[PDB]
Design a protein around this nucleic acid. Sequence first.
RNA 1: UUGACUGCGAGACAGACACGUCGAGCAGGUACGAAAGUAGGUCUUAGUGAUCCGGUGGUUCUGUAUGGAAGGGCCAUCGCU
RNA 2: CUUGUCGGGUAAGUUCCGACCUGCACGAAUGGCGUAACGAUGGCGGCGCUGUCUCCACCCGAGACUCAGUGAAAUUGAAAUCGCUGUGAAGAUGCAGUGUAUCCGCGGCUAGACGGAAAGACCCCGUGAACCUUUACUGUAGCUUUGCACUGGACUUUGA
RNA 3: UUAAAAACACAGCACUCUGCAAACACGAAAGUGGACGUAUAGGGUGUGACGCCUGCCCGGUGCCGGAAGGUUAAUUGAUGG
RNA 4: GGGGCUCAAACCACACACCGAAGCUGCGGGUGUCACGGUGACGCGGUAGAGGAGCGUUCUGUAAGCCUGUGAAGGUGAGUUGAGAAGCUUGCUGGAGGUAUCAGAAGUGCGAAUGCUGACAUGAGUAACGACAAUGGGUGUGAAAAACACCCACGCCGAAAGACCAAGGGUUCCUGCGCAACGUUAAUCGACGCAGGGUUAGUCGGUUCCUAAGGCGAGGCUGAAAAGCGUAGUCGAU
RNA 5: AACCCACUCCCGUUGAAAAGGUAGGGGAUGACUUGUGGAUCGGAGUGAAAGGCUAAUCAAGCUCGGAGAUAGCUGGUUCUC
RNA 6: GGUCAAGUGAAGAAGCGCAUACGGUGGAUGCCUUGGCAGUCAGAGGCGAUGAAAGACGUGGUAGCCUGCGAAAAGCUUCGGGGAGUCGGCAAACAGACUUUGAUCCGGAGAUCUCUGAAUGGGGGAACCCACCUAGGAUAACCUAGGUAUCUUGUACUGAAUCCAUAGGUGCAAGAGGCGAACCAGGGGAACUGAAACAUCUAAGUACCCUGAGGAAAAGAAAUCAACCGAGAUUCCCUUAGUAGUGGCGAGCGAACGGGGAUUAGCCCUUAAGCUUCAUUGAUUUUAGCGGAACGCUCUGGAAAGUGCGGCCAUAGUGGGUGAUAGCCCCGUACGCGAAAGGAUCUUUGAAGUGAAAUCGAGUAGGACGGAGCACGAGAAACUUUGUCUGAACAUGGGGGGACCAUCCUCCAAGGCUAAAUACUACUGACUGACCGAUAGUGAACCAGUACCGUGAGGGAAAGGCGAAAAGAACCCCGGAGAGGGGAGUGAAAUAGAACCUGAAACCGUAUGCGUACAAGCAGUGGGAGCCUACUUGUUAGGUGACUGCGUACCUUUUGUAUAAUGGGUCAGCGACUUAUAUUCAGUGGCAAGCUUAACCGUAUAGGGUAGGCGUAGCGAAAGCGAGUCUUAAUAGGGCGUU
Lengths: 117, 150
Amino acid sequence: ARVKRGVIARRRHKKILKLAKGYYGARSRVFRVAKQAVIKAGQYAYRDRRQRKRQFRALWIARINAGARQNGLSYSRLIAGLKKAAIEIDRKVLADLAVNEKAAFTAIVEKAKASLA
Amino acid sequence: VSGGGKKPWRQKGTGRARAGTIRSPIWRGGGTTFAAKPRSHEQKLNKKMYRAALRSILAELVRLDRLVVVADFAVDAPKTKGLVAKLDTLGLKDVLIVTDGVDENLYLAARNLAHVDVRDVQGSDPVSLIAYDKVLVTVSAVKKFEELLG
RNA sequence: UUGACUGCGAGACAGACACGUCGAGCAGGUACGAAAGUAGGUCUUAGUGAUCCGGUGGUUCUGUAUGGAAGGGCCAUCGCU
RNA sequence: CUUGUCGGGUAAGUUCCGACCUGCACGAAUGGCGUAACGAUGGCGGCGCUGUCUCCACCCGAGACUCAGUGAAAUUGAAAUCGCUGUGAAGAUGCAGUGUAUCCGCGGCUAGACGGAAAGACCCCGUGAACCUUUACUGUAGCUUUGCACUGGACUUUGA
RNA sequence: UUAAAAACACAGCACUCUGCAAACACGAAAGUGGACGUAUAGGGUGUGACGCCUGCCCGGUGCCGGAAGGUUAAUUGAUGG
RNA sequence: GGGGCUCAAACCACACACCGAAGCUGCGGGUGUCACGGUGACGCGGUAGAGGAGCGUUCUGUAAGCCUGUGAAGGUGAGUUGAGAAGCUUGCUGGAGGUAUCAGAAGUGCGAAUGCUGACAUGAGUAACGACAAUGGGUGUGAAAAACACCCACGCCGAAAGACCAAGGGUUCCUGCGCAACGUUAAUCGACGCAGGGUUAGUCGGUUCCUAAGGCGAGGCUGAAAAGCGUAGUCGAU
RNA sequence: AACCCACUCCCGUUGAAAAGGUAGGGGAUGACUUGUGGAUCGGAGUGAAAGGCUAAUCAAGCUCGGAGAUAGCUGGUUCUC
RNA sequence: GGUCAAGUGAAGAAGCGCAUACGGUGGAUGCCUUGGCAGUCAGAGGCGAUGAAAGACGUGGUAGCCUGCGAAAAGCUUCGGGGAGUCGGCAAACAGACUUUGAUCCGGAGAUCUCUGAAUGGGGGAACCCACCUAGGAUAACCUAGGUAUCUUGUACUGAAUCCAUAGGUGCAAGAGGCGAACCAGGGGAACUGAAACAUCUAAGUACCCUGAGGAAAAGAAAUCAACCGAGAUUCCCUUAGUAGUGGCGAGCGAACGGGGAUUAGCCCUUAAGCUUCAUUGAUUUUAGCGGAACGCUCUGGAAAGUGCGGCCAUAGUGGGUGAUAGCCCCGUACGCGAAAGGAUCUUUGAAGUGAAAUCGAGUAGGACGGAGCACGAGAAACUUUGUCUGAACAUGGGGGGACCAUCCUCCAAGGCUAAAUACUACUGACUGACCGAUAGUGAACCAGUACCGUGAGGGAAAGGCGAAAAGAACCCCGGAGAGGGGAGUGAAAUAGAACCUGAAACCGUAUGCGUACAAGCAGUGGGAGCCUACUUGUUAGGUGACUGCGUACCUUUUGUAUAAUGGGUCAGCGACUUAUAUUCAGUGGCAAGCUUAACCGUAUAGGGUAGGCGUAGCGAAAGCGAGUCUUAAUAGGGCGUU
Ligand SMILES: *C(=O)[C@H](CCSC)NC=O
Ligand SMILES: [Mg+2]
Ligand SMILES: [Mg+2]
Ligand SMILES: [Mg+2]
Ligand SMILES: [Mg+2]
Ligand SMILES: [Mg+2]
Ligand SMILES: [Mg+2]
Ligand SMILES: [Mg+2]
Ligand SMILES: [Mg+2]
Ligand SMILES: [Mg+2]
Ligand SMILES: [Mg+2]
Ligand SMILES: [Mg+2]
Ligand SMILES: [Mg+2]
Ligand SMILES: [Mg+2]
Ligand SMILES: [Mg+2]
Ligand SMILES: [Mg+2]
Ligand SMILES: [Mg+2]
Ligand SMILES: [Mg+2]
Ligand SMILES: [Mg+2]
Ligand SMILES: [Mg+2]
Ligand SMILES: [Mg+2]
Ligand SMILES: [Mg+2]
Ligand SMILES: [Mg+2]
Ligand SMILES: [Mg+2]
Ligand SMILES: [Mg+2]
Ligand SMILES: [Mg+2]
Ligand SMILES: [Mg+2]
Ligand SMILES: [Mg+2]
Ligand SMILES: [Mg+2]
Ligand SMILES: [Mg+2]
Ligand SMILES: [Mg+2]
Ligand SMILES: [Mg+2]
Ligand SMILES: [Mg+2]
Ligand SMILES: [Mg+2]
Ligand SMILES: [Mg+2]
Ligand SMILES: [Mg+2]
Ligand SMILES: [Mg+2]
Ligand SMILES: [Mg+2]
Ligand SMILES: [Mg+2]
Ligand SMILES: [Mg+2]
Ligand SMILES: [Mg+2]
Ligand SMILES: [Mg+2]
Ligand SMILES: [Mg+2]
Ligand SMILES: [Mg+2]
Ligand SMILES: [Mg+2]
Ligand SMILES: [Mg+2]
Ligand SMILES: [Mg+2]
Ligand SMILES: [Mg+2]
Ligand SMILES: [Mg+2]
Ligand SMILES: [Mg+2]
Ligand SMILES: [Mg+2]
Ligand SMILES: [Mg+2]
Ligand SMILES: [Mg+2]
Ligand SMILES: [Mg+2]
Ligand SMILES: [Mg+2]
Ligand SMILES: [Mg+2]
Ligand SMILES: [Mg+2]
Ligand SMILES: [Mg+2]
Ligand SMILES: [Mg+2]
Ligand SMILES: [Mg+2]
Ligand SMILES: [Mg+2]
Ligand SMILES: [Mg+2]
Ligand SMILES: [Mg+2]
Ligand SMILES: [Mg+2]
Ligand SMILES: [Mg+2]
Ligand SMILES: [Mg+2]
Ligand SMILES: [Mg+2]
Ligand SMILES: [Mg+2]
Ligand SMILES: [Mg+2]
Ligand SMILES: [Mg+2]
Ligand SMILES: [Mg+2]
Ligand SMILES: [Mg+2]
Ligand SMILES: [Mg+2]
Ligand SMILES: [Mg+2]
Ligand SMILES: [Mg+2]
Ligand SMILES: [Mg+2]
Ligand SMILES: [Mg+2]
Ligand SMILES: [Mg+2]
Ligand SMILES: [Mg+2]
Ligand SMILES: [Mg+2]
Ligand SMILES: [Mg+2]
Ligand SMILES: [Mg+2]
Ligand SMILES: [Mg+2]
Ligand SMILES: [Mg+2]
Ligand SMILES: [Mg+2]
Ligand SMILES: [Mg+2]
Ligand SMILES: [Mg+2]
Ligand SMILES: [Mg+2]
Ligand SMILES: [Mg+2]
Ligand SMILES: [Mg+2]
Ligand SMILES: [Mg+2]
Ligand SMILES: [Mg+2]
Ligand SMILES: [Mg+2]
Ligand SMILES: [Mg+2]
Ligand SMILES: [Mg+2]
Ligand SMILES: [Mg+2]
Ligand SMILES: [Mg+2]
Ligand SMILES: [Mg+2]
Ligand SMILES: [Mg+2]
Ligand SMILES: [Mg+2]
Ligand SMILES: [Mg+2]
Ligand SMILES: [Mg+2]
Ligand SMILES: [Mg+2]
Ligand SMILES: [Mg+2]
Ligand SMILES: [Mg+2]
Ligand SMILES: [Mg+2]
Ligand SMILES: [Mg+2]
Ligand SMILES: [Mg+2]
Ligand SMILES: [Mg+2]
Ligand SMILES: [Mg+2]
Ligand SMILES: [Mg+2]
Ligand SMILES: [Mg+2]
Ligand SMILES: [Mg+2]
Ligand SMILES: [Mg+2]
Ligand SMILES: [Mg+2]
Ligand SMILES: [Mg+2]
Ligand SMILES: [Mg+2]
Ligand SMILES: [Mg+2]
Ligand SMILES: [Mg+2]
Ligand SMILES: [Mg+2]
Ligand SMILES: [Mg+2]
Ligand SMILES: [Mg+2]
Ligand SMILES: [Mg+2]
Ligand SMILES: [Mg+2]
Ligand SMILES: [Mg+2]
Ligand SMILES: [Mg+2]
Ligand SMILES: [Mg+2]
Ligand SMILES: [Mg+2]
Ligand SMILES: [Mg+2]
Ligand SMILES: [Mg+2]
Ligand SMILES: [Mg+2]
Ligand SMILES: [Mg+2]
Ligand SMILES: [Mg+2]
Ligand SMILES: [Mg+2]
Ligand SMILES: [Mg+2]
Ligand SMILES: [Mg+2]
Ligand SMILES: [Mg+2]
Ligand SMILES: [Mg+2]
Ligand SMILES: [Mg+2]
Ligand SMILES: [Mg+2]
Ligand SMILES: [Mg+2]
Ligand SMILES: [Mg+2]
Ligand SMILES: [Mg+2]
Ligand SMILES: [Mg+2]
Ligand SMILES: [Mg+2]
Ligand SMILES: [Mg+2]
Ligand SMILES: [Mg+2]
Ligand SMILES: [Mg+2]
Ligand SMILES: [Mg+2]
Ligand SMILES: [Mg+2]
Ligand SMILES: [Mg+2]
Ligand SMILES: [Mg+2]
Ligand SMILES: [Mg+2]
Ligand SMILES: [Mg+2]
Ligand SMILES: [Mg+2]
Ligand SMILES: [Mg+2]
Ligand SMILES: [Mg+2]
Ligand SMILES: [Mg+2]
Ligand SMILES: [Mg+2]
Ligand SMILES: [Mg+2]
Ligand SMILES: [Mg+2]
Ligand SMILES: [Mg+2]
Ligand SMILES: [Mg+2]
Ligand SMILES: [Mg+2]
Ligand SMILES: [Mg+2]
Ligand SMILES: [Mg+2]
Ligand SMILES: [Mg+2]
Ligand SMILES: [Mg+2]
Ligand SMILES: [Mg+2]
Ligand SMILES: [Mg+2]
Ligand SMILES: [Mg+2]
Ligand SMILES: [Mg+2]
Ligand SMILES: [Mg+2]
Ligand SMILES: [Mg+2]
Ligand SMILES: [Mg+2]
Ligand SMILES: [Mg+2]
Ligand SMILES: [Mg+2]
Ligand SMILES: [Mg+2]
Ligand SMILES: [Mg+2]
Ligand SMILES: [Mg+2]
Ligand SMILES: [Mg+2]
Ligand SMILES: [Mg+2]
Ligand SMILES: [Mg+2]
Ligand SMILES: [Mg+2]
Ligand SMILES: [Mg+2]
Ligand SMILES: [Mg+2]
Ligand SMILES: [Mg+2]
Ligand SMILES: [Mg+2]
Ligand SMILES: [Mg+2]
Ligand SMILES: [Mg+2]
Ligand SMILES: [Mg+2]
Ligand SMILES: [Mg+2]
Ligand SMILES: [Mg+2]
């Protein structure tokens, strides 16, 4: 029972060369170089699913800070006032109200200022 | 493998990988690394394990309504038409016929019949009993099975 | 005066193994002391060399048909900067 | 030791020539000391001659350069392939900080790519390999000693 | 096929072996060369035209000679157990 | 680390606030062990290495079955399903074979070994085109002339770069027809392809006659065997 | 001069050439050069001696066998959870 | 609508990137096979001086090569078969023919059979040169047929030193010589390696070289073993048993006794079984052939064997191929028949030869020195054999029983012949395969031991597929009376067009869409505008990715590599934990104080065969004793063992 590897080896090569679509140069057309690029891309994707939550939290904070100072208060003083009184709205929704619903954001900030903090 | 009894090039200086013969398993026309030789794939099965297997199979044939027991079964003259008619009255198509002694006239028939095989009590292997859909045994052959298998 | 004894030996210390170290007590015979008793070398820790092979003294073993012998086994012991 | 010391040659001589004797460590057929002739032999010094040089200049042919035709090679993980100062498998195009910089050829030069070539020859290791040596060990061809055989007779001296 | 030389050879010198079926060399051997030669010849060794010369040591290791004594192989087999 | 910083954006004390990990909490999933009968509780980084469970390829049985010219294997896209190796359904090409399920045997899975064999890249349309005796016109043929043939005129060898024997080669010699490949360019030309033709001896060279070195060697001598030497003899030119 | 050789420089080093070329150079009646045929060879031959030469291979040729020698040493070792 | 100033900034690509669609190169993958590999059952086990194995040259209507033949040359003559086409293949075409008055074709026998090769008349560089004698025939410068090597054996003649005869010299007859893959019996005989070095030892009496014989060879009928009971020639298989021994007592080497089987057989020197060679009596095989049953209709389709419906044959139903898948289309298969003539085997009986050594075994048994073999390496070392040297007795005698002696037992050496069971396969035939399917399988599927490399010995390749059928593209146009194309025609299909099935990847192009000329780095990943396309008309799908946060490949080897340490130019194909025998542990099964067979027999996976192995009892070095035993003076202690 002699086994020939022609059919199965090709099927395995084409799976890698399909994930390497759009890569520059030999990284998309030769198996040896494309194999390393497909593995490295997977390492970056796993790592960058954690940075995505870091990158967006930094962006929301940078926007609540800019919008709170329009109303006369820093970011760190706004969080203390919100926590002291009652408000438990996320930084994702606070950043959205800062941009779109500027009238509601002012009402929230005046609630944090009124808490003496 | 023929030839290849000398080095192709010297050990050092050429710039090529190290080789000692052209008939190497790595080379194109080289030999097989673990080449086969003729060998026997026969196992050992105890006498009482072989008999305990027949006792196990023969019981299921009764439980699955596949063992048909008739009082004797003989056919005169070797004719495949004749045996086909005799097998039709019982409504049997795929049948193994087991008897104490295979008749000369009964062996000549069923030799060309498609899905019919004629055997002997000491000839019926474990594979044959399971392969066929129905098993036809004479009352005499039933007695023989009771003194070779206890 | 010969306990620098013979057969052992509960139980331990050390330790990869092979080796190593201490030892109450029992039985045979002993030596000192009037006797309880002490004595299985020296205040203790160094002073040493596996196996094979060959030699010597014993022996309720074996001994190539049988009776013996040769040879072998068991105990004691000798020969390696 | 040492470029020993003295003399000659040169403006100046670790080399050369002649001497001294303190011969680390000359020496008489593994010959000692001289020697005419000879040497594509080693060292030193002169005359002539000169682009060897100060210091290079011009000119003549063959390449190099452009056009038409044919058409290799070593090398190569992949490249969107800068400088500096640090860090770092301790000498960075690729890391950190920073500074410069539009995209692409052609003719030239070789400072880096620890550039290409050859599984370092130097050094060490392997209870590795060859060949060589001897008063290493163990043998051996050859040479030689004696007993027996082929191989006998007689006489004589001496021994039991 | 990176060394042409002071390296090798050389004429000349010396020591030593060889009496002929020569020493010596190639051959399990027959045989062959030496040599169809015969010590003014043949082999080995060292030095190296020519001139003047070549000094002391025989303790070591070689070679040559000697035969008295001491040791000493196969072989033989008295005696003893 | 840079910009830049002096009642500091430096240092010393005290106070409150915030940022900040894959840590902890929240929500949704998957697994290992233990206990009770699906629930709870504690876990789930990993090299050498131990243990457990699986995917896929070729062949055999199930299978004289099932699928298939109303289109098999193979190739190439798309969509979709799992935790993974992987599975499934279809468009185009293809043109005759494939193997459900469960078992059984392996030449059973490749990116490396300066690995082996083919094909194809980079260097790159880059180096080089093989003595620096040297070429310039006219004509002709031709699809096409720097190179072919002829004519005029230049250069080079001439103790050869001329002529002839031996060895060696073996049709390369001549003619007619050709230019794919060979010719380091083109070719109408050729030592290239095809097809015909061409080598005439008493005196030339061999053979026949004779021998040298040397070879073989009837008998013979010697040697485990193969064989060695050698007499008569008979081969061997230069 | 021919012929044999190979002392110097430069070029060439992917060469016109796996050892050449152009300029000069040594011997050139002799221990000379050369053609043809023959003899000696692998622990063996031959060597005016360089461990040199024995078919571009020599501190022991090439070829086929023992043989897949041995390698405590480098290198490589292929699907998933 | 103006002039000026400030700000802002679309398009415009020499070239390039990504995606997609089409090509090119290239030859993988799939499917296939006229070629290999490995078995089982038979055959016959040699050919050659009557010229072998291996060749050179010639032979055809035309050039070459292969295959056959040999100046009588793809053939000549006779027999036997059949039953109509044929003049071999690459390899087709054009002519000449052959024939039912029996061709080509197949088998038996016969004739011819160039030159070289043991090569054999003498030489020689193989395929060449030069001869002699006899018989016959020509008359010129020859032709036809025979012979002429060497050695061994027998025979006839003759005759050296030397008188006789010995050596020798001639002529006759018969035999040998060379080749071949393995097997068999002898002669000579390594090393690497192992012992983790290496000498004894091992590897191993292996590899290799040489000599003879046969289809088999060899060995064979007790001067053998056993143990006081017995067996009964040799050979091969399973155990005994990796035991007793042997061994720098190291690495290692390794029996026998006794059991179970395959085969059956002995006979002579007061002359036999047997073996050859003829001559007969019969039978069987072999070298070629003959017959050999049963299917129609319909649908798709280029084509039916395939769909649907209904039958028939069977001692023939998983054979090959025919335009796709056939028991009934063809060739076959099961099953019956067949030999003018050759070969072989087994057979009865006549003969000749041999067996064959004459009369029971003397330089023999035994002994001393040096070796070899025995499992046994000098060891207490018995036994066989012999290079050197010696050396008996005669059945009241001799050999052996593992140093040696005594007693018992058992055989008769120094003379011969003998089948079967056993080993092998270069060679031929039949069947089969959980073997390969063109980088695999033979080095070789094809004009392969070829091309090519080497002075030689020697080494040694690459290279398969149109279609069912050549129907292989008439004719026109461009082009050099080209190459190559565009049409037209054949075909189911020419992107099946002869480099022809399918036709991937690397690599090279054309076309469209988006991005790209102020920008610094493993080329990605997270966020993300704009543009283009499709359509479900924007919480959508596909292509592109301006700008921006993080971000120094893979393998190996290491204490540690982005490392400027290794390896890789890329793609495709191949490429590394296997197999046999002995065992130990675990899982899972069959029997159970028992379990299980090996060789072998056999209907041959059954069944038989329980020789043997393990277990039910241990202790001791052993005799031995045994729920105990050993140590010891010891029923003390202690070691090991027992429910
Ligand atoms: C020593 O420095 C060595 C010289 C060796 S000569 C055999 N280095 C060489 O490069
Ligand atoms: Mg991209
Ligand atoms: Mg691509
Ligand atoms: Mg790859
Ligand atoms: Mg071969
Ligand atoms: Mg070889
Ligand atoms: Mg080999
Ligand atoms: Mg070899
Ligand atoms: Mg290299
Ligand atoms: Mg090898
Ligand atoms: Mg291979
Ligand atoms: Mg390969
Ligand atoms: Mg092969
Ligand atoms: Mg059985
Ligand atoms: Mg049947
Ligand atoms: Mg303790
Ligand atoms: Mg006491
Ligand atoms: Mg007292
Ligand atoms: Mg005895
Ligand atoms: Mg006895
Ligand atoms: Mg004794
Ligand atoms: Mg000095
Ligand atoms: Mg001075
Ligand atoms: Mg002066
Ligand atoms: Mg000077
Ligand atoms: Mg002197
Ligand atoms: Mg000297
Ligand atoms: Mg001196
Ligand atoms: Mg002198
Ligand atoms: Mg002297
Ligand atoms: Mg001198
Ligand atoms: Mg002098
Ligand atoms: Mg000179
Ligand atoms: Mg001088
Ligand atoms: Mg000067
Ligand atoms: Mg010039
Ligand atoms: Mg150009
Ligand atoms: Mg730049
Ligand atoms: Mg640093
Ligand atoms: Mg740095
Ligand atoms: Mg980087
Ligand atoms: Mg950086
Ligand atoms: Mg930086
Ligand atoms: Mg440039
Ligand atoms: Mg330069
Ligand atoms: Mg440079
Ligand atoms: Mg460098
Ligand atoms: Mg190497
Ligand atoms: Mg190295
Ligand atoms: Mg050295
Ligand atoms: Mg050592
Ligand atoms: Mg070591
Ligand atoms: Mg002697
Ligand atoms: Mg000279
Ligand atoms: Mg010299
Ligand atoms: Mg002399
Ligand atoms: Mg000298
Ligand atoms: Mg002296
Ligand atoms: Mg003296
Ligand atoms: Mg003397
Ligand atoms: Mg302050
Ligand atoms: Mg977090
Ligand atoms: Mg967590
Ligand atoms: Mg949870
Ligand atoms: Mg884990
Ligand atoms: Mg964790
Ligand atoms: Mg199957
Ligand atoms: Mg289709
Ligand atoms: Mg398949
Ligand atoms: Mg498909
Ligand atoms: Mg698909
Ligand atoms: Mg078809
Ligand atoms: Mg088919
Ligand atoms: Mg299956
Ligand atoms: Mg594999
Ligand atoms: Mg690959
Ligand atoms: Mg890997
Ligand atoms: Mg590779
Ligand atoms: Mg390489
Ligand atoms: Mg190019
Ligand atoms: Mg360039
Ligand atoms: Mg250039
Ligand atoms: Mg150029
Ligand atoms: Mg030129
Ligand atoms: Mg040139
Ligand atoms: Mg030229
Ligand atoms: Mg002209
Ligand atoms: Mg012209
Ligand atoms: Mg010209
Ligand atoms: Mg002139
Ligand atoms: Mg000629
Ligand atoms: Mg020609
Ligand atoms: Mg011509
Ligand atoms: Mg012409
Ligand atoms: Mg042209
Ligand atoms: Mg041309
Ligand atoms: Mg021509
Ligand atoms: Mg002559
Ligand atoms: Mg002569
Ligand atoms: Mg001779
Ligand atoms: Mg002779
Ligand atoms: Mg002559
Ligand atoms: Mg002659
Ligand atoms: Mg002549
Ligand atoms: Mg000449
Ligand atoms: Mg010379
Ligand atoms: Mg020189
Ligand atoms: Mg010059
Ligand atoms: Mg000259
Ligand atoms: Mg010159
Ligand atoms: Mg001179
Ligand atoms: Mg001169
Ligand atoms: Mg001469
Ligand atoms: Mg020779
Ligand atoms: Mg030499
Ligand atoms: Mg040479
Ligand atoms: Mg040698
Ligand atoms: Mg050697
Ligand atoms: Mg060679
Ligand atoms: Mg050679
Ligand atoms: Mg090897
Ligand atoms: Mg070996
Ligand atoms: Mg690795
Ligand atoms: Mg394509
Ligand atoms: Mg057979
Ligand atoms: Mg032929
Ligand atoms: Mg004739
Ligand atoms: Mg006829
Ligand atoms: Mg002849
Ligand atoms: Mg002859
Ligand atoms: Mg002749
Ligand atoms: Mg013969
Ligand atoms: Mg021998
Ligand atoms: Mg050895
Ligand atoms: Mg071993
Ligand atoms: Mg060893
Ligand atoms: Mg070793
Ligand atoms: Mg060693
Ligand atoms: Mg050995
Ligand atoms: Mg015969
Ligand atoms: Mg016989
Ligand atoms: Mg007898
Ligand atoms: Mg016997
Ligand atoms: Mg008896
Ligand atoms: Mg020892
Ligand atoms: Mg029929
Ligand atoms: Mg059919
Ligand atoms: Mg029909
Ligand atoms: Mg005879
Ligand atoms: Mg006699
Ligand atoms: Mg007798
Ligand atoms: Mg004897
Ligand atoms: Mg003796
Ligand atoms: Mg002996
Ligand atoms: Mg012995
Ligand atoms: Mg011993
Ligand atoms: Mg004797
Ligand atoms: Mg005897
Ligand atoms: Mg005896
Ligand atoms: Mg016999
Ligand atoms: Mg092949
Ligand atoms: Mg294929
Ligand atoms: Mg091949
Ligand atoms: Mg197509
Ligand atoms: Mg087609
Ligand atoms: Mg093609
Ligand atoms: Mg095609
Ligand atoms: Mg087809
Ligand atoms: Mg492609
Ligand atoms: Mg485009
Ligand atoms: Mg700027
Ligand atoms: Mg831009
Ligand atoms: Mg850049
Ligand atoms: Mg930057
Ligand atoms: Mg950069
Ligand atoms: Mg995104
Ligand atoms: Mg979109
Ligand atoms: Mg992005
Ligand atoms: Mg980015
Ligand atoms: Mg970054
Ligand atoms: Mg690596
Ligand atoms: Mg390292
Ligand atoms: Mg390190
Ligand atoms: Mg790092
Ligand atoms: Mg790297
Ligand atoms: Mg780098
Ligand atoms: Mg390095
Ligand atoms: Mg690296
Ligand atoms: Mg390395
Ligand atoms: Mg390294
Ligand atoms: Mg590399
Ligand atoms: Mg059990
Ligand atoms: Mg006890």
